[PDB]
Amino acid sequence: MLKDYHLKEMPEMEDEFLEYCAKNPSYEEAYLKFGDKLLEYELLGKIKRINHIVVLAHH
C-alpha cells in the first residue's frame, strides 16, 4: 500500500528460517546467521540433523 522506509518491527521471524533451511548444504550457515533458532528447531522436530547436514522434517 503505502511507502515504508527503514522502519520495521522485529517480533520474531522464524518462517524466514524455515524456508532457508531448504538450503540443506552448509546447515552451519543457517545456524550461525540466525542463532539458537536451528538448535531448538532441531531438538523440536521442524528440522532434524543426523547425516552431515540438515534435513527438513515436515510433520
Side-chain angles (χ1 to χ4, degrees):
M1 290 180 179
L2 216 68
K3 196 276 177 184
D4 299 297
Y5 301 93
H6 295 78
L7 291 79
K8 189 172 184 64
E9 64 291 298
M10 289 76 65
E12 179 60 65
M13 299 177 189
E14 62 182 61
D15 181 60
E16 182 179 294
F17 177 80
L18 239 176
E19 293 299 298
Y20 274 26
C21 284
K23 186 194 296 182
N24 305 108
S26 292
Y27 77 122
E28 37 174 0
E29 293 176 0
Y31 162 37
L32 294 163
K33 183 244 171 173
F34 287 79
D36 304 298
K37 187 59 63 178
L38 188 137
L39 302 180
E40 55 179 297
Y41 267 26
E42 184 179 300
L43 289 166
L44 175 51
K46 287 185 167 181
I47 44 176
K48 296 180 295 182
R49 184 265 182 192
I50 183 61
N51 185 241
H52 291 86
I53 49 170
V54 70
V55 292
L56 293 162
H58 179 65
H59 296 163

